[PDB]
Design a protein around this nucleic acid. Structure first.
Lengths: 110, 328, 111, 122, 111, 109
RNA sequence: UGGCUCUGCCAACGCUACGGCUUGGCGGGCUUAGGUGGUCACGGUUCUGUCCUGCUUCGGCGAACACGUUACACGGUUCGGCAAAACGUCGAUUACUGAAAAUGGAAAGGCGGGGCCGACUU
RNA sequence: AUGCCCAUCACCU
RNA sequence: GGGGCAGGCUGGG
């Protein structure tokens, strides 16, 4: 259900948003795009939950996958390090938690 | 300006002029397929017009065949924006050098020599000279009788620039007896053409109290047989020289009223012609019994402009008494 | 149902002042909150130009996203936090718009 | 010479855009007048204002009524932005006359959009 | 051809307009950002049109070109600072017209 | 998918440094380039999730606009940002992820 | 345009790969034309009232309420004086120049008032 | 469709 | 008889 994923994704955001606000201005486009992928994937979950097409529950998965990309991208983006590898690991754990919930939700719809 | 004018196609196609022509052509037409198809690549279009005029490859597109009847049918075939723009780009450099020759009394298509400067000129020149009489004439089918040939001897004693001349002749072939009515080029070239009568009034004939608005020609006198003279001389001229037949004329006493310019102009009063009234009366009455008493305020405001000149106080009171609506 | 927008325009009227307040610091969140807040009008508008329930649910998702933004902007920390009061006293406004959207969703669902 | 043809020369899109350009030409100075603060919503208003042209244009060229309704959804959102810039923008953004004036211009574009939606709907 | 040609001719629009659009002040930076997204993002419209040869995709490439021409009009019209001198609109419209010609031929080739 | 993204990761890892050399002047085209560079990951990903070719061609259009961005950053950007060599190598990376995108298009249709 | 992929400083939400980053202050740098509508230059037929059948220079103009057809007095439709100049126009796409007026080019003069100068009013 | 004055809405000098 | 004005009725619009 949308409420569960979002509350668990709020933990991703609550971890990553501080991290994504640290991403240097130098990596500012990546940061603002990461932040718009982080805060933003909430909308993907929410849209998936307040409607139903299962395409919206995949678009939420794509957003989580994009968020995972952002983690791997921001980890080792350049010398202005954006996200420390640890932060990617921690965030990937939280994103994996919301990934699991999405997956279960995709499955329960399917 | 030293006469001549032997390089107007350079000024007609100056970008700064075609942009004026463009803004003049689009003025009001900024809601037409012509402007809106032109507006898209406006300045790239004016760059292919500039360079069509600067070349001489300019050729006037089809006069979009359409007309308005109003039992005075004029074939007022439209022109492409491109074509009205070229005409506006001509009649931005070509018009000031023709409309400067226009004797002051040609109160037609000139800047601020308007319809109303005309009715005022007539009234004024009626008061002064205390015209006891007046000749009013009018050209049969004026635009479809402009020689378009003895026009281009007037458009050609004053252009001298043999590419303005060839742009004038694209916009208006030197081959006809019929200026297309409803063309900036043609209001000018008909003003210019009927300006030949204004020079046979004012120059020859030495009529100093007249007014011409395009095809209508008031000629206040004092001996009404000197104005039948003037008229005879004017008709013989405009027939033999201009191929203009005079449709209507009269040498009415200033007492019949000079039905000039949709008016009726005694020294005393300038009552718009009774047909304007009847149209308006009927337009108002219709608007009332159509439930359209809100576009009537728009029409009223506009008509009050056409009638603020005329001595329409009594009429405005009367229309306020018949329907209540705020005329003035 | 265009009382939706005119009841959401009091959500905006409550939330926009405190969305503008979000510092450059929380600037992406702000831009995105403002795009959720001011851009929920478009969600309602699109819903009312279609009366298609999909656009009505997208308006609900936007209100739910706006609710998220409230809860997010709450725990944004520091002197930039949407005060708990404002989260509650906007959730009230959003809830009023939520009630409408709901009724509107229901009106369409039971045609 | 022939005016450069844009393809899919749709009168209604050309007209609406020329008339909506008057909305923009009215609102842009008073979107660009929206203070620094209220820049996110100026930029959002500006993306609604200047980005409604794209909505009209895609409606005219991708002659699809869906994009015409999406253009009406954006004219409606532009109307909201007027509402918002007036009331909810805390300084002022749009004076009541300015809202009054802009709403007239947007209404003109609304009329043209409505006529365009109607002519396509038949 | 077709998509490759249109884009190479549209690259000239971008090569002309990007400096103008990169010159549009931060004040007109929604204009600028949206003009840049219209200018540089018309390549994506052509690209998608090449990918599909759906004439609707080359019509939405014309819509983008029309939007780009709007941006020229608009950026000339903005009178706070200014963005695109009337000449720059003229020059750009020539380039966009060349892109327009190729889009028109491409639309016709598909028709 | 997974492999297209990892090969596009190599595009990003090559191009992102280039996009970040792009002067402030061209920071709106950098912003725009980086939203087609980093934002093409989303195009690939969304095609991986919603496996529609409609989503897959938008990723090819994304790849093709990324190739445009290479052309643009190499020349049209006036301090020709991307060096011609970098466009060549990036088009190698882009055409690897384009060879993958093409194969993926083909596998779907 | 709350912007800077922009710094310096300082501070601390924080995040730190321990370098910083971020972020906050704080400085410096970069950042008159227009629109809409009209306005003047829709009829056809019998009917019911109602009136004219005026005028004419024979072209037409009218009057049946705009009704004192008129705000019955004026616009700047003002009033004189001028008309040198400039403008206009004819002279003239002339003389002249030059093979050619060829996208040179007058003028004297003639004709205007459109112009000028006052008065009074605007 | 062109002109002509108005009327309005706008917008800065 | 003709004609002008305001209403009948029918088109234009």
């Amino acid at each position: 259900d949308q409420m569960l994923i979002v509350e668990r994704y709020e933990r991703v955001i609550s971890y990553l948003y501080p991290i994504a606000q640290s991403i240097p201005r130098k990596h500012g486009v990546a940061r603002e795009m990461f932040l718009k992928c982080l805060l933003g994937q909430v909308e993907l979950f929410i849209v998936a939950g307040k409607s139903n097409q299962v395409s919206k529950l995949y678009a939420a998965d794509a957003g989580l996958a994009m968020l995972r990309f952002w983690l791997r991208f921001l980890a080792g983006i350049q010398k202005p390090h954006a996200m420390t590898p640890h932060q990617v690991e921690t965030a990937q754990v939280l994103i994996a938690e919301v990934g699991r919930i999405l997956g279960s939700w995709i499955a329960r719809v399917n | 300006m030293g006469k001549r004018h032997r390089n107007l196609i350079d000024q007609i196609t100056t970008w700064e002029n075609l942009l004026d022509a463009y803004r003049k052509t689009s003025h009001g037409k900024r809601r037409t397929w012509g402007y809106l198809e032109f507006k898209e690549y406006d300045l790239a279009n004016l760059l292919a017009l500039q360079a069509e005029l600067k070349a001489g490859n300019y050729e006037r597109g089809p006069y979009r065949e359409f007309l308005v009847y109003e039992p005075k049918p004029r074939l007022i075939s439209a022109l492409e924006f491109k074509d009205r723009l070229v005409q506006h780009a001509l009649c931005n450099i070509v018009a000031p050098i023709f409309e400067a020759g226009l004797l002051p009394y040609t109160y037609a298509c000139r800047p601020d020599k308007g319809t109303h400067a005309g009715v005022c000129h007539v009234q004024a020149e009626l008061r002064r000279t205390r015209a006891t009489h007046f000749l009013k004439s009018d050209f049969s089918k004026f635009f479809p009788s402009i020689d378009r040939a003895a026009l281009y001897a007037m458009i050609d004693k004053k252009i001298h620039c043999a590419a303005t001349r060839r742009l004038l002749r694209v916009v208006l072939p030197d081959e006809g007896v019929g200026i297309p009515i409803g063309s900036l080029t043609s209001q000018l070239f008909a003003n210019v053409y009927g300006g030949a009568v204004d020079r046979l009034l004012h120059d020859e004939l030495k009529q100093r109290h007249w007014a011409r608005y395009m095809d209508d020609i008031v000629v206040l006198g004092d001996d009404p047989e000197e104005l039948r003279a003037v008229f005879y001389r004017l008709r013989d001229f405009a027939s033999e020289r201009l191929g203009l037949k005079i449709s209507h004329w009269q040498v009415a006493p200033v007492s019949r009223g000079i039905n000039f310019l949709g008016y009726r102009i005694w020294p005393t009063h300038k009552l718009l012609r009774k047909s304007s009234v009847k149209r308006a009366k009927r337009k108002v009455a219709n608007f009332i019994k159509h439930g359209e008493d809100e576009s009537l305020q728009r029409f009223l405001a506009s008509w009050s402009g056409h009638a603020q000149w005329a001595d329409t106080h009594n009429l405005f009171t009367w229309m306020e008494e018949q329907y209540g609506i705020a005329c003035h």
